[PDB]
Amino acid sequence: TFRKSFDCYDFYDRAKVGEKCTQDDWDLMKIPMKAMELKQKYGLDFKGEFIPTDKDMMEKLFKAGFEMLLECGIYCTDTHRIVKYTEDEIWDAINNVQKEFVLGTGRDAVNVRKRSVGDKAKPIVQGGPTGSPISEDVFMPVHMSYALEKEVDTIVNGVMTSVRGKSPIPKSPYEVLAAKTETRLIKNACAMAGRPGMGVXGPETSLSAQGNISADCTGGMTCTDSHEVSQLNELKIDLDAISVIAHYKGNSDIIMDEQMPIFGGYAGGIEETTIVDVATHINAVLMSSASWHLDGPVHIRWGSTNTRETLMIAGWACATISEFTDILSGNQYYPCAGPCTEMCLLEASAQSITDTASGREILSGVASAKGVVTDKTTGMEARMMGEVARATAGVEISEVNVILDKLVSLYEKNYASAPAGKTFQECYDVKTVTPTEEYMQVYDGARKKLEDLGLVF
Amino acid sequence: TFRKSFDCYDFYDRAKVGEKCTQDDWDLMKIPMKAMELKQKYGLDFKGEFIPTDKDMMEKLFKAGFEMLLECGIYCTDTHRIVKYTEDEIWDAINNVQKEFVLGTGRDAVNVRKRSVGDKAKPIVQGGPTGSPISEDVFMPVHMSYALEKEVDTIVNGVMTSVRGKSPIPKSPYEVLAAKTETRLIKNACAMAGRPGMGVXGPETSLSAQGNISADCTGGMTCTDSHEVSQLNELKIDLDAISVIAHYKGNSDIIMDEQMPIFGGYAGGIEETTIVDVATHINAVLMSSASWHLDGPVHIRWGSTNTRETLMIAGWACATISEFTDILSGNQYYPCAGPCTEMCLLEASAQSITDTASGREILSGVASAKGVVTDKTTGMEARMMGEVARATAGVEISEVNVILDKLVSLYEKNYASAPAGKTFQECYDVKTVTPTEEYMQVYDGARKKLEDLGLVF
Amino acid sequence: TFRKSFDCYDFYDRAKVGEKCTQDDWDLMKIPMKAMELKQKYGLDFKGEFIPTDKDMMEKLFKAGFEMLLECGIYCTDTHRIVKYTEDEIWDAINNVQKEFVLGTGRDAVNVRKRSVGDKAKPIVQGGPTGSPISEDVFMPVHMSYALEKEVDTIVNGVMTSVRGKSPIPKSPYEVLAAKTETRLIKNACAMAGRPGMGVXGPETSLSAQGNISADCTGGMTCTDSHEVSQLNELKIDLDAISVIAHYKGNSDIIMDEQMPIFGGYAGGIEETTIVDVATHINAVLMSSASWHLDGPVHIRWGSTNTRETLMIAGWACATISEFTDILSGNQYYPCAGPCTEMCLLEASAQSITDTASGREILSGVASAKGVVTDKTTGMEARMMGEVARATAGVEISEVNVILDKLVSLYEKNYASAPAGKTFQECYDVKTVTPTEEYMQVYDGARKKLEDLGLVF
Amino acid sequence: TFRKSFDCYDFYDRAKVGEKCTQDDWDLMKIPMKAMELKQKYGLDFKGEFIPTDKDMMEKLFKAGFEMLLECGIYCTDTHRIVKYTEDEIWDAINNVQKEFVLGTGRDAVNVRKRSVGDKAKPIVQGGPTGSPISEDVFMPVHMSYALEKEVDTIVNGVMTSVRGKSPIPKSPYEVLAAKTETRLIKNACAMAGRPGMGVXGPETSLSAQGNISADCTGGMTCTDSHEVSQLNELKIDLDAISVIAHYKGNSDIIMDEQMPIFGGYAGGIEETTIVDVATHINAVLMSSASWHLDGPVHIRWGSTNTRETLMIAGWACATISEFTDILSGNQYYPCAGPCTEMCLLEASAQSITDTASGREILSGVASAKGVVTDKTTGMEARMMGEVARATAGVEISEVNVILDKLVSLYEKNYASAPAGKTFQECYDVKTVTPTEEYMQVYDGARKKLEDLGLVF
């Protein structure tokens, strides 16, 4: 049996005396070799499906992911050493995951419970800038655009480009100020939308351990909000994250561990990246004591989470995790196109269909324009994400796979020419925080195309 | 109909003017006569089963238990009088029991909901010294050994052998100090294990009404913890308990009423003691306004809760209570053997199998070495209790009865020679609060034997 | 030096092994002998003064009181043993008393700070039934009559004659219910008077340790209220009080220790009883860890606190305690006459003059009709107590002594024929909680007599 | 006038673009040159006095300290640049300092208000290990030894040598665990001593910014506790401190800025080091937004705060700060000798006399054995610190200077041979947390010598 249930403290201990290894040995050899080995040994073949319907193949994928984590371990970037788990330690973690939890408070609180593949229940809609840069002068209005949408259940924080007119440079007092201020302003925005108790997910503006740790404060982040800790790529972590985890645990905070496996990255192709994805979903409840895990497979070239390959990775990973474990999870949205464009809405829709049908409990979006363009995220994208989730819930998986193939085909040949879209200030009337007629028309056009494909709103 | 829903105040009123009766008339005549009468009148025969599969027999057991309570009433030790209920008052209590509740707070909170016989859902694991005496200098470390186990959901408090180097003598200021300190230290231990919000069950160190009433305090016991009130043997109570109940109710505290029927005691044998057990489960929601009831059938000679007879009593009582009522319940663990011994683990395992399959919502253990030897309780026993519960959940009852017969046979001939075991300090590295390799090996050996019997972990 | 600062735990320890002694040996020998000895050794002679102006005599009184406590110790009624203090332990207590504190919360909170003899500052007016029996159906209205008076700062709780129509018998669940309910109802009354945050003093209805300990609860007593612990007569205590003290300390509650020395009692006459009074003021901060001490010298025959002798005892004790220590204190009011009578108002006035001029920080009244007649206490008596305190503040002590001699002479010959007065229901319009014109006229008459004596309102 | 009131954010801004300078240029040239220049320009000469009685000389010292800060600025170790203030910015800070504040909560809270030189009021006694290393297994008992002393008002935290048996290595998860655990355990200790609401000062175990920032937590440090930020030597700071300050401000925490100028250090001698001391008291309310400032002049060779030179530095700095500003301050205790030795008590006594008479509002001690020997700190040293403060309060300054000269002469020739003393476990009965008779005898001996010098307890 195991000595003790594994935690961040054991990780630190092992990271100091583990097997020495260069990062190149890890990225260019250990990880790709094992993923390649497991794919062939288990004969993994997704056969073009977005959501699996072959339980035998799913079970092999689960075993592959488990074995990947067990045999490789986790690389610590600060110590350049590898942390290894034992089989019994991994099972202790999987066998004792958080079953459910509540986000938010008061009338605005919501229950997060497990969803199965093709579940009739709708997933939780976590809407917001999704970590995208937002100008200080419109920080509240932008977030209000999500709180004002009944489709949205919780908020995923945007990043403050400045606080008191200064950049929140990591390890500067401005980073601490931004960490506390970010959620204080967002909850104020939610209150103005008549939903003071909405839960949030962050902290996003802070990047250092000290910055993230300062986020819990009166009026700001509290235990009923999702606290983010980020895993690196692939099966890798830094010590800052380990200390942040200790802090979240010590405050009884709901913990959201996230990992964004890269298709075409160190692991390799579709099946290989999915093996890694399953492994990181498991690592979330082991290393990070996560309450839930946020996925986000991204295309090495396009940098989007809704390409045919990344949707397949997410669909298989979640369906498998949902089938063999009780791990609560979600997926994050990175469309190529910007706001107020049909492509952006269709891209997010394809992912919402995939995430909903595959069994995700939480949908966290939408970081339009790949989340790197200031102010290019609005509540309209989250509204579509939510409506599509409602439409997808309960639909037969065979039908979903057909719809996805047709939908993805509508935009997968335009990644290089994805429309830049508009900023919040351009497609919304900032003063009243309402979308322009132009955006409403674009929304209708996209919705119509989805209906023609078979979706019933 | 009834005049008003029955409560502790009505009990006091009736206890002052009820039928006068000596305790011997109650213990040596009224109770044994009625149990004997009801067993024969309803033709109760468990036929060697640990968990019943005959609903007709179960219904007769329920009727017998109901009639036992209705015809006998409850003996008040302080007034030497009998309190009688009416049929309508008993039904009002049974028809309005607490459906579910939450224990603990923050990320560490857990939901307690009803479980049926053979339920696929796992019961709540309440781990701790289980009222056993613990040395002051290791009070926190010992409890930490349970909080560090992911298998454990809530903590059941141990007893402080001293506070500030003095015995917590009943009705002395030290008892009050211990009552408040006990949970304050335990929650501090839980915080050190990264689970600040774990719920607890107590107060254990205090024995008087004034001591128990002082336990609710800042940093200590709160409404999200289970508050203990103890019934006496059999169908008996003291006025101190009645005042404690009034206090718990007045603070909106979750109330845990407990009763430990004695096999071979005043009621008689197996079926007779089970009739009493059903009667006390019902009395819990009537006299104590209980949120849930904790059982604990004990062998008059061995003083253990896992003998063949006591397991049968618990299994039948719970299966029956689960079938005909919505009363939430749990069972407490008293193995003969001490920590770091295979017998202790096997004894607790047999009870975990019985409790899980019979429908218990909460498992409260483990008071190793019969809970009377200082420091002889560790988190390892709770880990086994939890793993076995997971393995038992969902298993066919016919298979469970077969496994139990084989398992109990492995130790039921060694009660008189049960190994004393070791103290926490002997089988754990106190500084890091981790089990020794010796204990881990013992654990593996016991687990292996359970697997050979058919359990799948 | 001392081993450790003395507390209730040390008291318990010593009470179990102290010198064995019968209560008669204590009451009829040890106490009277020492008081007699110290009076003569220090040549104490108050020469008819109510408030001392001779600092030399005051210093001797302080030394006498200190020596009384040091040489006699405290008799424990439950163990029939004597607890002895060392000189260094007593000084450690006196040298570290609470300097000030806040009662109540929000806008209604008040600061309690030290007052000197003849201080210009007005003492805190704690008004209420002062432990007198109040009918359940008018419990809130009666207390509202005090909260509605701007003269009143905090409330001193009355006793519920019944709760849910039943007597709060000690050690019954009704006592617990009354302990919590008492303050919950009183604070509700204060809220109806537009002062939700008024602090209170109790618990009064409960008599047992378990009853008093149950009083701290949501909506009821909290740390910003004065928590009562009662010393016995004379230099005596029971173990119940010791456990209650441990509870108050463990909850960070403001503690009010009280003692009511009896003139003509076991100690003897005026100077003798004052020596005991000084000794019990000191014992309050030693044995009870008191935040403040409530006095209440009472006449062995008349049972009142405003006789010439009892006023002199209180005046000298407080002036002396104020001069040589920083101990915060108050005095309680027990007039012979009942409500709506001129005598009652004049009796309370004489005590308010004495308490204010002698340096009391808190005035706790008024228990009209000696506090033993149901519903015979109203806010009008507290209004007079407050107005008189304002008028007395800052007045030259020589003038105060003259006024007191004249005032006490107006009623000291009518103790045996003191008017019974009226109940709240008779001298107030219960529906609007306002005094009758009859009472207002009586009040005016009494006020006029006080003005003729020299008081300026 | 100034652009805006100066804060940590402005500091960061200026530290990035300030004048480049090596640390040697700062320590070996800029600082010593300016201190030397100002000493001569203002003709500072303390003439052997511990506490000044020459207001003209004090005013020149204040001007010197102000000019030192204005002309030199503050060196930032991370950017190797100098931050400069304007005269108007410094005055804005001095003219708007915190007037008073409350530490702790409930009955145990205490008010911190300004004290003048020779003030009759006693300073606040902050007792504890004073940052000294304490073994994990006695962490609570050791702190309880201070809470049990009525002389102690608040607690100054010790350092955990281990948490869960592991060293709290900076930037490891163990540091975060220790930061939260430290105060949680200490407040638990205070609760066991019957003072749950005692305020504390920390966090001490954590050294990194992330570690210190994690200290605010439920059950741990809160806004009513003093939050420590440390200045470097001399007129120097690191960016970690700047971020910690932003965090404390963002949580509305009471901030305690500390600086320990070194006699014989970079500034030079007595007057030179005092000029720096005044400058850092001022910098506290400017750079750190301090609520109060903790001083601690230390001897470059002896490493103690109670040498003749360091006592003079503290006395003059505080008397001057008290005379010309409303800045609240305290001093920290580092005796050469260890616990249970007469020298340790006499050393701490000399500092308590100096601090009390010079006007300090808070006394923070005692870090016996120079605070570097595990477990060598006990509540007995804090008791002496408190008793001596009481004895010193109100004494004529001329008399104090005479007493100090005689007292310091009793040990200043034995620094090299200062007795090592004993650990808590050796001079206390750990189980009951009470001093041994041996320690009590040592205490009496030291007290007797102080009385012979003129102190009246």
PDB file of N, CA and C in Angstrom, chain B residues 1-11 13-14 85-86 88-90 92-93 249 286 289, chain C residues 164 166 174:
ATOM      1  N   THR B   1     -55.127  12.122  16.810  1.00  0.00           N
ATOM      2  CA  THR B   1     -53.796  12.636  16.389  1.00  0.00           C
ATOM      3  C   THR B   1     -52.999  13.018  17.633  1.00  0.00           C
ATOM      4  N   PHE B   2     -51.766  13.469  17.437  1.00  0.00           N
ATOM      5  CA  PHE B   2     -50.909  13.860  18.552  1.00  0.00           C
ATOM      6  C   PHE B   2     -51.157  15.307  18.973  1.00  0.00           C
ATOM      7  N   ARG B   3     -50.847  15.637  20.224  1.00  0.00           N
ATOM      8  CA  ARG B   3     -51.049  17.002  20.698  1.00  0.00           C
ATOM      9  C   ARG B   3     -50.035  17.925  20.030  1.00  0.00           C
ATOM     10  N   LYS B   4     -48.771  17.518  20.053  1.00  0.00           N
ATOM     11  CA  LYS B   4     -47.706  18.295  19.433  1.00  0.00           C
ATOM     12  C   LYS B   4     -46.568  17.348  19.093  1.00  0.00           C
ATOM     13  N   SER B   5     -45.731  17.728  18.133  1.00  0.00           N
ATOM     14  CA  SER B   5     -44.603  16.879  17.781  1.00  0.00           C
ATOM     15  C   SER B   5     -43.785  16.718  19.054  1.00  0.00           C
ATOM     16  N   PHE B   6     -43.431  15.479  19.367  1.00  0.00           N
ATOM     17  CA  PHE B   6     -42.681  15.187  20.579  1.00  0.00           C
ATOM     18  C   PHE B   6     -41.256  15.736  20.576  1.00  0.00           C
ATOM     19  N   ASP B   7     -40.823  16.258  21.720  1.00  0.00           N
ATOM     20  CA  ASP B   7     -39.460  16.764  21.858  1.00  0.00           C
ATOM     21  C   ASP B   7     -38.936  16.548  23.276  1.00  0.00           C
ATOM     22  N   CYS B   8     -37.678  16.914  23.496  1.00  0.00           N
ATOM     23  CA  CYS B   8     -37.028  16.746  24.793  1.00  0.00           C
ATOM     24  C   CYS B   8     -37.786  17.396  25.948  1.00  0.00           C
ATOM     25  N   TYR B   9     -38.534  18.457  25.658  1.00  0.00           N
ATOM     26  CA  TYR B   9     -39.289  19.141  26.698  1.00  0.00           C
ATOM     27  C   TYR B   9     -40.453  18.270  27.149  1.00  0.00           C
ATOM     28  N   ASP B  10     -41.112  17.618  26.196  1.00  0.00           N
ATOM     29  CA  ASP B  10     -42.220  16.728  26.527  1.00  0.00           C
ATOM     30  C   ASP B  10     -41.660  15.551  27.313  1.00  0.00           C
ATOM     31  N   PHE B  11     -40.458  15.117  26.949  1.00  0.00           N
ATOM     32  CA  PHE B  11     -39.845  13.994  27.639  1.00  0.00           C
ATOM     33  C   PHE B  11     -39.662  14.331  29.112  1.00  0.00           C
ATOM     34  N   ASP B  13     -41.220  16.538  30.914  1.00  0.00           N
ATOM     35  CA  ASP B  13     -42.546  16.619  31.530  1.00  0.00           C
ATOM     36  C   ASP B  13     -43.045  15.238  31.949  1.00  0.00           C
ATOM     37  N   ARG B  14     -43.007  14.299  31.012  1.00  0.00           N
ATOM     38  CA  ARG B  14     -43.480  12.944  31.271  1.00  0.00           C
ATOM     39  C   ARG B  14     -42.600  12.159  32.232  1.00  0.00           C
ATOM     40  N   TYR B  85     -44.899   6.942  24.782  1.00  0.00           N
ATOM     41  CA  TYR B  85     -45.242   7.657  23.558  1.00  0.00           C
ATOM     42  C   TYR B  85     -46.564   7.096  23.051  1.00  0.00           C
ATOM     43  N   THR B  86     -47.222   7.828  22.157  1.00  0.00           N
ATOM     44  CA  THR B  86     -48.451   7.331  21.553  1.00  0.00           C
ATOM     45  C   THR B  86     -48.040   6.929  20.140  1.00  0.00           C
ATOM     46  N   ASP B  88     -49.345   7.770  17.292  1.00  0.00           N
ATOM     47  CA  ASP B  88     -49.337   8.923  16.403  1.00  0.00           C
ATOM     48  C   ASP B  88     -48.099   9.794  16.584  1.00  0.00           C
ATOM     49  N   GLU B  89     -47.588   9.872  17.809  1.00  0.00           N
ATOM     50  CA  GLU B  89     -46.393  10.672  18.063  1.00  0.00           C
ATOM     51  C   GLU B  89     -45.187  10.015  17.410  1.00  0.00           C
ATOM     52  N   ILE B  90     -45.114   8.688  17.485  1.00  0.00           N
ATOM     53  CA  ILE B  90     -43.995   7.982  16.880  1.00  0.00           C
ATOM     54  C   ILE B  90     -44.009   8.142  15.361  1.00  0.00           C
ATOM     55  N   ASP B  92     -45.324  10.594  13.633  1.00  0.00           N
ATOM     56  CA  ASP B  92     -45.021  11.981  13.290  1.00  0.00           C
ATOM     57  C   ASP B  92     -43.504  12.148  13.223  1.00  0.00           C
ATOM     58  N   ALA B  93     -42.790  11.499  14.139  1.00  0.00           N
ATOM     59  CA  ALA B  93     -41.334  11.583  14.155  1.00  0.00           C
ATOM     60  C   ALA B  93     -40.733  10.855  12.957  1.00  0.00           C
ATOM     61  N   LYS B 249     -30.367  21.700  19.862  1.00  0.00           N
ATOM     62  CA  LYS B 249     -31.493  22.201  19.077  1.00  0.00           C
ATOM     63  C   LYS B 249     -31.492  23.722  19.054  1.00  0.00           C
ATOM     64  N   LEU B 286     -37.172  10.755  17.758  1.00  0.00           N
ATOM     65  CA  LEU B 286     -38.313  11.119  18.580  1.00  0.00           C
ATOM     66  C   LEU B 286     -37.859  11.898  19.814  1.00  0.00           C
ATOM     67  N   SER B 289     -34.442  14.320  18.642  1.00  0.00           N
ATOM     68  CA  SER B 289     -34.545  15.189  17.466  1.00  0.00           C
ATOM     69  C   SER B 289     -33.293  15.007  16.607  1.00  0.00           C
TER      70      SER B 289
ATOM     71  N   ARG C 164     -42.411  28.930  27.218  1.00  0.00           N
ATOM     72  CA  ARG C 164     -43.346  28.010  26.584  1.00  0.00           C
ATOM     73  C   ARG C 164     -44.320  27.481  27.640  1.00  0.00           C
ATOM     74  N   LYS C 166     -43.832  26.858  30.783  1.00  0.00           N
ATOM     75  CA  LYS C 166     -43.271  25.969  31.795  1.00  0.00           C
ATOM     76  C   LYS C 166     -42.178  26.649  32.613  1.00  0.00           C
ATOM     77  N   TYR C 174     -35.804  22.992  30.073  1.00  0.00           N
ATOM     78  CA  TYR C 174     -36.436  24.306  30.077  1.00  0.00           C
ATOM     79  C   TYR C 174     -35.472  25.387  30.555  1.00  0.00           C
TER      80      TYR C 174
END
